[PDB]
Amino acid sequence: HQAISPRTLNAWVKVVEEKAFSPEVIPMFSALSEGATPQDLNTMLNTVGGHQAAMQMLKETINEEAAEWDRLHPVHAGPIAPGQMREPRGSDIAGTTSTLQEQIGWMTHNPPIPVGEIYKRWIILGLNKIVRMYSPTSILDIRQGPKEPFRDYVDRFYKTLRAEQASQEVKNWMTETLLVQNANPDCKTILKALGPGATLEEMMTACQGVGGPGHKARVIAEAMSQVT
Amino acid sequence: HQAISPRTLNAWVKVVEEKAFSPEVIPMFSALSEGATPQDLNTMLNTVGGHQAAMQMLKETINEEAAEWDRLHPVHAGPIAPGQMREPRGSDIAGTTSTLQEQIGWMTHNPPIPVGEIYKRWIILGLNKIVRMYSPTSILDIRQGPKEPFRDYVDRFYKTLRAEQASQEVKNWMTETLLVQNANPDCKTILKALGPGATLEEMMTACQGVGGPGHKARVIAEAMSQVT
Amino acid sequence: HQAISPRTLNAWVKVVEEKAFSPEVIPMFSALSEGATPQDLNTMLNTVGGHQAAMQMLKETINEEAAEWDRLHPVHAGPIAPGQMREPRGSDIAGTTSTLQEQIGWMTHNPPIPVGEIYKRWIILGLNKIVRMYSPTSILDIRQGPKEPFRDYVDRFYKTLRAEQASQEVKNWMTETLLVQNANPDCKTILKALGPGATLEEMMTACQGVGGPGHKARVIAEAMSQVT
Amino acid sequence: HQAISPRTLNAWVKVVEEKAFSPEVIPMFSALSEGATPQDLNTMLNTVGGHQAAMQMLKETINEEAAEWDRLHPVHAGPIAPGQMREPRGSDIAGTTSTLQEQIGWMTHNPPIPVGEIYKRWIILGLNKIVRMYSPTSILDIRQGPKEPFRDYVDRFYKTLRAEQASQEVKNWMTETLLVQNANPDCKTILKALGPGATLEEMMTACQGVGGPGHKARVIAEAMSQVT
Amino acid sequence: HQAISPRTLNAWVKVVEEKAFSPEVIPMFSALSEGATPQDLNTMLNTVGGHQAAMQMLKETINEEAAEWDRLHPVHAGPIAPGQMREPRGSDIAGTTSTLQEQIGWMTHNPPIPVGEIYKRWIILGLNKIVRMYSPTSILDIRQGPKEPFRDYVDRFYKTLRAEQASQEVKNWMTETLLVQNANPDCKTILKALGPGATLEEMMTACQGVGGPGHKARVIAEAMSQVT
Ligand SMILES: C=C(C)[C@@H]1CC[C@]2(C(=O)O)CC[C@]3(C)[C@H](CC[C@@H]4[C@@]5(C)CC[C@H](OC(=O)CC(C)(C)C(=O)O)C(C)(C)[C@@H]5CC[C@]43C)[C@@H]12
């Protein structure tokens, strides 16, 4: 049997990262998965890096459809007759407790039990649910809350950037611009009043006092003096 | 033998989606599953999307009624009758344990044990409880809290919007109007200060200030100046 | 043989409803259906609710391709063939004049005559034409014509709104806002002169005179007063 | 066999005429007709007076479901049937082809064929379509169009009044009230200028020339005089 | 036998959509189709997309020529002729009631019956009538009538645009630059007074009032003020 080529896996993971589970991933997933055994489907699903929420949703959908298949399709009791073997359970279709040899036997037997296409249908349902209900996070969509500490947002921004898929120079440029650009107006004002090019430690120290008693009293004083 | 059809099941899910678990769903259900085997009832009940809380309540009702049936109706001592007939335990009425063939045999046996009717009654009780206490959520119910950050409110708004059953055009229109309509007065005045047609990122950048020390000082000073 | 399942069919109906015959339905149809007998895609198409014009265009396309298939493939000589059953026609590939046993025999015969794949291709062409040409209707597209009386406007608005797929609360909200949001400047002026919270009957009564001699005289007199 | 009874049928007609295909007619239909042969439900549907569009939609849905049943369930090969009677079809389940004896034989066979329940399910789907789509017409809904001549408005009013089910004194009261209560501002003004108690012929004579050159010129001149 | 090839058929389709039934299509049809069996020209004519009126006229011409051929050539006596196969008929030359084997046998016989050239002559006559009479519809021909409401104008404009042969970017440019260019002086001046870059919905809202009592009164009063 023909397994999944490494170039196929690379293309699948690349489209996964590039489209960020856009609807355009639904067609692509079909195109490179035609005639694929459920073990190959599981391998092609596992290599997707990141997007843990999407993987959780897809696994939940797979489990739901496997349970439905188990309920609708019963099992046969008794010794297995020669010329045949065990009927595919829901997990067998999902490729969790079915060996590759058994899956290939199911596909190539006459009449053929389409374990691969049923599994692909379950994964397609999961992917449709994902593209309907999943909104990817990005370094552009992480900002600082009105009362959130500056240090905590710096740590969260660094974690999100470390989770990003981009070149090192691009990430450094994003650190240079977005950090000051996307911040609490108080934190942004403190950073902008400070000279550009200040180190991260200095910009954290300058914003370490944001939200404290002294800063609140000072800003109240400025507001009261300005209005009056 | 008799089995459910795609048309009736589609109509059932459509009426469930249309009326948000209103009382009008109790008759229609009982009007669609007449003479239905428990497996057909389970398939009818598991196909409704959304309303996870209501479905959880209905399920819990099913388990409690199955436990009551098991308590009231005892099981045999263990030996099997020469007629090869098994008394239906509480679990298998709901279809979790028994298969389609066993349910059909029970429903066709003389005298008939209408397991489908008992399961339908249990599901009816669950639906009655659902309409009694459970209330579905809606996009119009999403309102920004008094101390809520704008980013979290937008996240909640879009999370509820994605699961809502509607078309893309109406969804975009609701995004355009409701999101700025339902907002904190502090957030709403800032949004109204911005001209119409401002993008979502501009809205969030403008509203990032509310609840922070600077915004609080500004509103306090403005109110003090206006009063005196 | 494994036929369609309620989950996949319901997902197909849901994706059709959510995206009103957007291009994204072309791959999903190619993904949910695989190895499906012509009766299976017939069920897959019939359960689609609404979009009667689109379904009519799809049916016309299927008739066109069936006629072309009949034209290109003639009747084999010999009405009786003990070796193998009859050859497919244009209509029975579409499933109108075929039984499930015959379709299964065709798709399983050696060599295979994939009536399912050919029918799927015909429906794919139909959906491509649909997404190329058909424009879905929506409640926001309902707008009062300049000379349209308010009563027929309201009748059309409620007809499309009731044909719309949504919830009761959001439908009531649409009735509250869009009815006066989409109206002629004369009817809009009359309704704005009415205080907010006026009933539908009050609004219909207030706009009964739009287009009559009394209105067409009063507006002209007001304009003459304004410009003189 | 116990067929339908005059009390249940009369109550069915009464409830349909009372709530006018409100959702509350869905349970009663499933309540007043249980165990009914398809001829009984055919009689139940035929005796309904009025609501021609509703019955149009209902029986259209009935033919749709019958065609779907014919598609899914094929004619059994071999006209010979010595052991038992013929298998049902869509039309002969809907009652338009089978006889009462055949329906009774099916509904009491071993195993039974629930012809009555299937037909009741089809009528239930049709009734749900009615209550979702059909809006009853009422005398209070008759309003004169802005450019509609008074004679045709009166003709429409009296046509729907005759179609209305009420008492003669009640109908006379509706004639006395709604005729002048539902009219264009021009016709309303003309009628109010007429003294109360004017006959219908005098009322029609007074509004015979609304929309003619003389009336339009008179109202335009009055508006000009008021403005200047 | 050498049937038609995809390249020539695609070229024929391309020239038809390029010059839109200009006279230059008459030679190409006689050049691409040489020695073609009637089935080949039937395929050549069916693949033509658009120009439904022109194809209907061509079908009418073919029917007329077939009727004339049947009139001038009678059906020879003798139900069965062992010496030679049957003689052609009017509808048979068009390929409606003939198979490819029969057409090949006729076009290759001693003496030959040139069914292909006769059918080609009929299609050439039809094409000549088409190029003489039929005028293709284009997007530039869509102009809104003096009394046409703007909404139906936009509907017609998009309906004809959606059937064009252009690309997406040029289609968007044509929407941007042609909708306002082809409009009534009233609608055009409303759109010019309205700021450039306004959305389609804003434009439709602006021109919703054209043709109503308020707009007519306003323009009449403006003209009266101008000339007095
Ligand atoms: C008495 C007055 C106070 C003033 C003092 C003298 C006057 C002036 O100096 O102003 C001379 C001009 C007139 C007479 C006005 C009165 C009004 C009229 C009128 C506004 C009347 C309504 C008519 O409109 C129609 O015909 C309606 C329409 C839809 C077009 C249809 O049915 O065809 C038109 C033709 C538009 C005229 C124009 C001429 C003027 C201005 C006079």
Residue numbers in the entry:
A (entry chain L), B (entry chain K), C (entry chain J), D (entry chain M), E (entry chain G): 12 to 239
Task: Give verbatim excerpts from the published study on this entry.
The Gag polyprotein, composed of MA, CA, SP1, NC, SP2, and P6 domains, is the sole viral component needed for the assembly and release of an immature virus particle, which is accomplished by the oligomerization of Gag into a lattice structure at the plasma membrane.
Utilizing PFO-treated VLPs, we obtained two BVM-bound immature GagCA-SP1 structures, which include: (1) a 2.10 Å resolution structure with both LEN and BVM bound to T8I VLPs; (2) a 3.09 Å resolution BVM-bound structure from NL-MA/NC VLPs. A comparison of the two structures reveals that BVM binding in both VLPs is consistent. To better interpret the averaged density, we modeled six symmetrically related BVM molecules inside the cryo-EM density (left), which was then compared with a surface contour generated from the symmetrically placed BVM molecules. This led to accurate positioning of the BVM model consistent with the “up-orientation,” where the dimethyl-succinate group is oriented up towards the CACTD. However, the location of the bound BVM is more distant from the IP6 binding site and closer to the SP1 region than previous structural studies proposed. However, the pose of the bound IP6 molecule is altered when BVM is present. Upon BVM binding, the density for the axial phosphate of IP6 is no longer in the pore center. The binding of BVM does not alter the structure of GagCA-SP1.
